[PDB]
């Protein structure tokens with residue numbers, strides 16, 4: 145039941161036996177929206193906001209951020225747009241920040257840790273996001289979360305800015321959903337604790353794999369140690385999905401794995417709610433979903449979770465994709 | 469029932485209700501043995517071997533390594549000596565190696581990854597350890613293990629050198645036990661898979677905490693994010709201990725947590741078999757073990773595993789230690 149792109153665009157990612165999932169786009173600039181919609185994106189599962197901070201000599205103003213966020217939210221016309229707060233560290237050059245030199249920047253002062261130490265930066269971004277939420281379906285997502293304590297600290301600043309907007313008579317979505325990236329292993333291991341205090345999870349498998357295997361995903365000398373289908377990763381993914389569902393929340397994935405045809409059936413079978421990916425990956429994943437029964441996918445996921453080697457998992461999924 | 473050092477030395481680390489655990493020493497040079505024995509060490513749970521590789525212009529010969537290993541094994545007189553294979557990376561200067569410059573050395577080309585890419589170095593060390601095993605109770609431990617595949621690769625080289633020694637008519641302990649450091653999160657998450665193919669685990673909580681929380685344990689700017697009592701760490705520790713026990717293997721811990729009085733009762737209650745620590749920490753931990761019932765410790769561990777914040781866990785353990 146494979147379909148062509150033109151036919152697929154308006155079709156749902158639904159199994160022949162009625163299991164529906166959401167396919168969304170990852171974007172890094174408002175310019176990416178056109179392609180996302182052209183590929184049938186049902187939302188933006190990850191709006192990377194670093195573009196507003198790069199290649200400039202001062203912080204992006206609240207207004208500039210707001211205009212950027214609003215544009216995307218408007219164009220998505222009601223579809224949910226999940227905006228990830230600043231996720232940057234000392235490995236990038238930002239003339240206006242003054243970041244410490246670090247031996248291991250990926251394990252250092254970055255992302256939510258930077259924002260909590262620089263609430264001036266954080267409040268500005270949160271204000272712009274909140275203001276944009278008046279014009280569509282907006283969700284907030286915190287990156288590099290290691291603990292529920294950090295979520296509470298971040299939410300405290302969020303509530304602070306909400307109160308500011310209230311006093312200023314500025315509109316925002318009072319029901320705005322707030323979730324976290326799951327990419328630090330501790331967040332996956334304690335997803336049950338976090339699930340009680342976040343509206344949703346989005347699994348960042350790029351860095352989850354990096355941290356869980358202790359392998360820099362950019363380091364050529366150990367590239368063979370970077371293994372997304374390592375059983376540990378599948379187990380952590382399952383843990384996050386189950387944890388969200390136990391509390392009646394949703395689990396998304398915006399790591400590259402979500403756009404991987406080899407992973408599609410496993411993710412479907414594990415009960416992943418939302419796949420977020422490069423726009424042009426959407427039709428391919430949709431075709432797979434539409435051509436595999438949910439019950440079959442669950443059997444396949446179960447089989448994958450019982451294997452011991454990434455290699456045999458990949459071999460199995462190669463065959464599955466072959467059969468359709 | 470607190471005892472003085474002189475009385476404690478020969479006493480076992482045994483709860484009033486009969487639960488015995490092993491207290492062992494971490495050492496970094498043969499010179500450390502005297503202090504280990506003086507403090508009642510029942511073995512060496514971690515022999516860090518980097519001393520043989522540091523501050524020199526060529527690799528340590530098989531003979532030099534052998535003499536060092538033999539000395540320690542002899543002096544320990546029958547007590548088990550767990551020797552950790554080379555655990556070093558590019559962050560250290562070794563004139564004779566030529567290591568790549570890396571953005572994140574802690575996630576890079578180091579330890580077992582170096583040894584697998586440089587089997588000449590690995591074989592020499594394994595030969596020296598094997599040869600030393602003819603003279604006492606020796607165990608081998610691989611560091612920075614992320615997957616069972618790596619254990620199999622390492623063991624292949626071990627069996628290769630064993631076969632060499634056989635041909636040369638050189639003695640070694642045919643029953644030598646071979647285990648792994650659990651410090652990469654994936655190793656803890658898949659401890660059930662690893663447990664079938666290792667003789668024992670030793671939990672390296674120093675780096676397990678670093679990788680699990682994605683926090684460089686040497687980076688001052690994020691030091692507050694390094695939290696050994698984060699529930700994720702306790703859960704991973706429990707997972708490793710239970711996994712070993714399900715396969716009838718032993719679980720040790722050589723991370724600093726094992727020498728932490730605050731952790732003692734939790735570790736005891738979780739069923740940790742072996743605590744390895746700086747020698748002078750042994751009597752303090754022994755006193756605690758001897759003054760808390762196993763059944764009580766299990767209740768306390770269970771209580772700790774049900775908490776959500778490292779802070780409340782630490783507060784609870786402060787009180788426990790206060791009461792004795």
Ligand SMILES: [Mg+2]
Nearest residue numbers: 327348350351
């Ligand atoms: Mg990431």
Ligand SMILES: [Mg+2]
Nearest residue numbers: 651672674675
């Ligand atoms: Mg270590």
